[PDB]
Design brief:
The complex is a heterotrimer of chains A (187), B (224) and C (220). By secondary structure, chain A is of the alpha/beta class. Chain A is built from seven helices and six strands; from the N terminus they run βαββαααβαβααβ. Helices cover 34% and strands 22% of the residues of chain A. In chain A, α4 packs parallel to α5. Chain B is mainly beta and 224 residues long. The radius of gyration of chain B is 24 Å and the shape is elongated. By secondary structure, chain C is mainly beta. Chain C has two domains: 1-114, Sandwich (Immunoglobulin-like), CATH 2.60.40.10; 115-213, Immunoglobulins (Immunoglobulin-like), CATH 2.60.40.10. Chain C is built from two helices and 21 strands. Chain C has helices at residues 128-133, 189-194, and strands at 4-7, 10-13, 19-25, 30-31, 36-37, 39-44, 51-55, 59-60, 68-73, 76-81, 91-96, 103-104, 108-112, 120-124, 136-145, 150-156, 159-160, 167-169, 179-187, 197-204, 211-216. In chain C, the strands form five sheets. In chain C, strands 2, 6, 7, 8, 11, 12 and 13 form a seven-stranded mixed sheet that branches. A four-stranded antiparallel sheet of chain C has the order 1-3-10-9, with no helix packed on it. In chain C, strands 14-15-19-18 form a four-stranded antiparallel sheet. The longest helix of chain C is centred in the middle third of the chain and has 6 residues, at 128-133. Chain C is elongated, with a radius of gyration of 23 Å. The chains are: A alpha/beta (187), B mainly beta (224), C mainly beta (220). The interface between B and C is large, with 52 and 55 residues. The complex binds calcium ion. Calcium ion binds at residues 11, 13, 78, 111-112 of chain A. Chain A: Glycans are attached at residue 93. Chain A: Residues 3-181 form the VWFA domain.
Chain lengths: 187, 224, 220
C-alpha cells in the first residue's frame, strides 16, 4: 500500500563519488523495502529534469541495482520547486503506474538551496498537500547550517519538521541514516 | 590550442531558414553547455539559448521561441543553431559559447567562437553608382580642402574605397555603409592642401568584388 | 528577466589612469549555498569575439593581468583597471548567470581621451552625374571632432527636412583620436529642383552657436 518516489539533486556541486554514494543509498533503501506492494520511482533534477524509472517500469523490473546503475548526473543549477511539481504531476500519475488509494511518499535528497527557479515553494507545496504527498527531505552538507537554509528544508518537508527532516554532514554519512528512514517507510 | 570553430558568413532571402554550426577543436561537447548569443551591429549581446549535448535538453529566451532551434551532434562534435522565417531583424553576428562544468552549480561562458555573419535581404547583386563630391562654386578657401566620393546603391557588402590607388592614405576616412532601399550607400572623405587641388589629381577608386566592378572617378571642380 | 545596468555607456580614458565601471542587477546574484556571485565580465576588442575576463565577480580568468580587478556583492558590481594600457580599449560587458534567461549589460566602451575639437563641416551639392540618373543627394561631412556626441539639422529654404536623411559615424581614429560623421539627404531630381537653399547645421560641445554650412542651387 506504498508508492515511494525519489527526487535526487544532480546539480554541479555534487562530486562524482558523492553522486554514486547517493545512488548507492537509494539502491540500498529499495533493497531493504522488499515488500511486493511497495513501488518506487526516481527523478533527477538540477536545472533540467529526468525520470529515470516510473512506478510501472519498476514493477516490470524490480531490481534496484539494475535501475540505479545507468543514472548519469545532470549537472548545473538547482530548481527544487520545479522538481517537486514535476514529481507530483509526472511520477504520481496513473499512466506511469501510480496506484490510487496507495500512500504517496516523496524523498528529496539535496546538497544546496534552490536558486533561480521559475517556481517558488508556494506554487508547488499546496498542490502536493492537496494530492496527499508525504514528503521527506535529506539536507546534505554545509549548505544547511544557517537558519534560513534550515527553514527551506522545513518548507520542502511535510509538517512537523522534526518527523520529516533529515540532515547529514556529507554523502558518506548517508550510510549512517539507512536505519531510521526504513522506520519511516512503512504505511 | 582549444577554440570554438564556427561556420562561414551567410546571405539569405527573407522567410528562409539558416543553420549555423559550432565545432570545438579541443574538447567534447558532452562535457559542456553550448550557448548561442546574438549581437546586432550597434546593440549589445542577446542570449538566444543553450543545449546540454549529453541529453539534448535545451533552454531558450522566450523572445526566440519559434525563431531559434538549438541542436547538437555528438558524433561530429558539433552544436547547431537554426533560424527560421528570417526577417531583417535577424541580420546580426551569432556567437556560440561554452559553459564548462567545473564542480559548481553553473558557470560563466569561458570559450567563445569567432562569430557567424548572417545577412537577411531580398536584394540581388547590384553594382554601385560612384558620384564625385567636389565643393560648390562659391565655397571660398582655407589651407586645406575636403573632397568626397559617394558610393550609392550596391549589394552586397563590402566595397573598398581608396584614393589615388592608395597614395593618398593620410587625411582619409570611409564612413560605414548604411541601408537605403534594400541596397547600401557609403561615402569617403579626403582632406588635401588647397595647393595640390584642383592643380593636381585626386581620384577615388572604388571596387565591388561581388559585381566584379572597379570604378575610378577623378574629382574635378564644379562645372561653373 | 534580470536587468544588468552598466554605467557609463562610454568612458574617456588616458594611458596609465585608473578606471572604474559599474554593473547593477535588478535581482541578487549571491547564491547562499556556495557564497558566490553569479557575475561575469567580458572584454570585446574591436572586430573580435567577447572574451571571459572575470567570473564569480572577482576571480580573474587565466591570462588576465592583475591590473583588472572585479569587486562587489549581491547587486552592485565594479570592474577596475589600475593603470590602463592602450591594448585595454574595448567594450566591457557584464553578465548574470544566476538564472535563465542569461542577461548581459549594455556595455562600457573605453575610448581614448584627447583635447576637444570642433567639426569641419562641408556641404556638397548633388553631382551632375546623379541628376542624369534621376535622384539627387546632398552630402554633409562633419570631420575630426571630439567628443563623439554631435547633432545634425538639415534645412531646405528654412523648413527642417527629416525624411531622406541617413547618418553614419566612424569609429574613433587610431592616429588623431577624433570622430567623423556623414549625413546624406536624398530626394528625387524633381524634389531637388523645387527649392534653392540647402543647409546642414552641426551642434557640438565646442560652441553654443551651431556650425552652419549652406549652398544655393542658383549659385555659380
Ligand atoms: Ca548543488
Amino acid at each position: 500500500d506504498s508508492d515511494i518516489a525519489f527526487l535526487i539533486d544532480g546539480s554541479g556541486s555534487i562530486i562524482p563519488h558523492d553522486f554514486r554514494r547517493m545512488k548507492e543509498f537509494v539502491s540500498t533503501v529499495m533493497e531493504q523495502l522488499k515488500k511486493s506492494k511497495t513501488l518506487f520511482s526516481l527523478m533527477q533534477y538540477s536545472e533540467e529534469f529526468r525520470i529515470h524509472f516510473t512506478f510501472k517500469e519498476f514493477q516490470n523490473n524490480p531490481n534496484p541495482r539494475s535501475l540505479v546503475k545507468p543514472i548519469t548526473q545532470l549537472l548545473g543549477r538547482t530548481h527544487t520547486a520545479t522538481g517537486i511539481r514535476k514529481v507530483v504531476r509526472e511520477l504520481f500519475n496513473i499512466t506511469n503506474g501510480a496506484r490510487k488509494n496507495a500512500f504517496k511518499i516523496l524523498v528529496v535528497i539535496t546538497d544546496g538551496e534552490k536558486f533561480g527557479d521559475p517556481l517558488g515553494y508556494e506554487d508547488v507545496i499546496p498542490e502536493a498537500d492537496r494530492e496527499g504527498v508525504i514528503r521527506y527531505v535529506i539536507g546534505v552538507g554545509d549548505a544547511f547550517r544557517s537558519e534560513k537554509s534550515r527553514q527551506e528544508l522545513n518548507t520542502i518537508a511535510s509538517k512537523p519538521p522534526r518527523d520529516h527532516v533529515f540532515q547529514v554532514n556529507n554523502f558518506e554519512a548517508l550510510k549512517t541514516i539507512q536505519n531510521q528512514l526504513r522506520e519511516k517507510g512503512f504505511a | 590550442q582549444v577554440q570554438l570553430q564556427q561556420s562561414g558568413a551567410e546571405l539569405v532571402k527573407p522567410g528562409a531558414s539558416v543553420k549555423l554550426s559550432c565545432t570545438p577543436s579541443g574538447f567534447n561537447i558532452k562535457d559542456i553547455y553550448m550557448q548561442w548569443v546574438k549581437q546586432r551591429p550597434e546593440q549589445g549581446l542577446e542570449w538566444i539559448g543553450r543545449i546540454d549535448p549529453a541529453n539534448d535538453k535545451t533552454k531558450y529566451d522566450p523572445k526566440f521561441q519559434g525563431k531559434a532551434t538549438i541542436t547538437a551532434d555528438t558524433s561530429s562534435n558539433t552544436a547547431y543553431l537554426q533560424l527560421s522565417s528570417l526577417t531583417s531583424e535577424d541580420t546580426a553576428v551569432y556567437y556560440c559559447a561554452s559553459e564548462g562544468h567545473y564542480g559548481y552549480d553553473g558557470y560563466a561562458m569561458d570559450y567563445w567562437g569567432q562569430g557567424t555573419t548572417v545577412t537577411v535581404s531580398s536584394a540581388k547583386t547590384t553594382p554601385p553608382s560612384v558620384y564625385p563630391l567636389a565643393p560648390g562654386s562659391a565655397a571660398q578657401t582655407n589651407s586645406m580642402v575636403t573632397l568626397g566620393c559617394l558610393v550609392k546603391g550596391y549589394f552586397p557588402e563590402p566595397v573598398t574605397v581608396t584614393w589615388n590607388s592608395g597614395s593618398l592614405s593620410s587625411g582619409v576616412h570611409t564612413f560605414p555603409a548604411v541601408l537605403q532601399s534594400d541596397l547600401y550607400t557609403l561615402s569617403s572623405s579626403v582632406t588635401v592642401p588647397s595647393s595640390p587641388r584642383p592643380s593636381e589629381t585626386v581620384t577615388c577608386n572604388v571596387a565591388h568584388p561581388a559585381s566584379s566592378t572597379k570604378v575610378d572617378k577623378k574629382i574635378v571642380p564644379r562645372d561653373c | 528577466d534580470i536587468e544588468m545596468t552598466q554605467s557609463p555607456s562610454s568612458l574617456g580614458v588616458s594611458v596609465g589612469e585608473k578606471v572604474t565601471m559599474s554593473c547593477k542587477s535588478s535581482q541578487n546574484l549571491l547564491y547562499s549555498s556556495n557564497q558566490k556571485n553569479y557575475l561575469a565580465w567580458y572584454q570585446q576588442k574591436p572586430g573580435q569575439s567577447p572574451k571571459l575576463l572575470i567570473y564569480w565577480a572577482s576571480t580573474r580568468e587565466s591570462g588576465v593581468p592583475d591590473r583588472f580587478t572585479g569587486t562587489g556583492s549581491g547587486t552592485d558590481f565594479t570592474l577596475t583597471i589600475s593603470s590602463v594600457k592602450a591594448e585595454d580599449l574595448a567594450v566591457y560587458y557584464c553578465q548574470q548567470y544566476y538564472s535563465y534567461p542569461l542577461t548581459f549589460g549594455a556595455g562600457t566602451k573605453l575610448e581614448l581621451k584627447r583635447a576637444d575639437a570642433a567639426p569641419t563641416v562641408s556641404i556638397f551639392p548633388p553631382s551632375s552625374e546623379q541628376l542624369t540618373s534621376g535622384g539627387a543627394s546632398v552630402v554633409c561631412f562633419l570631420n575630426n571632432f571630439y567628443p563623439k556626441d554631435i547633432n545634425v539639422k538639415w534645412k531646405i529654404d528654412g523648413s527642417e527636412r527629416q525624411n531622406g536623411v541617413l547618418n553614419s559615424w566612424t569609429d574613433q581614429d587610431s592616429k588623431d583620436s577624433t570622430y567623423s560623421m556623414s549625413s546624406t539627404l536624398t530626394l528625387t531630381k524633381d524634389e531637388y529642383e523645387r527649392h534653392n537653399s540647402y543647409t546642414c547645421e552641426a551642434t557640438h560641445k565646442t560652441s553654443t552657436s551651431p556650425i552652419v554650412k549652406s549652398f544655393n542651387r542658383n549659385e555659380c
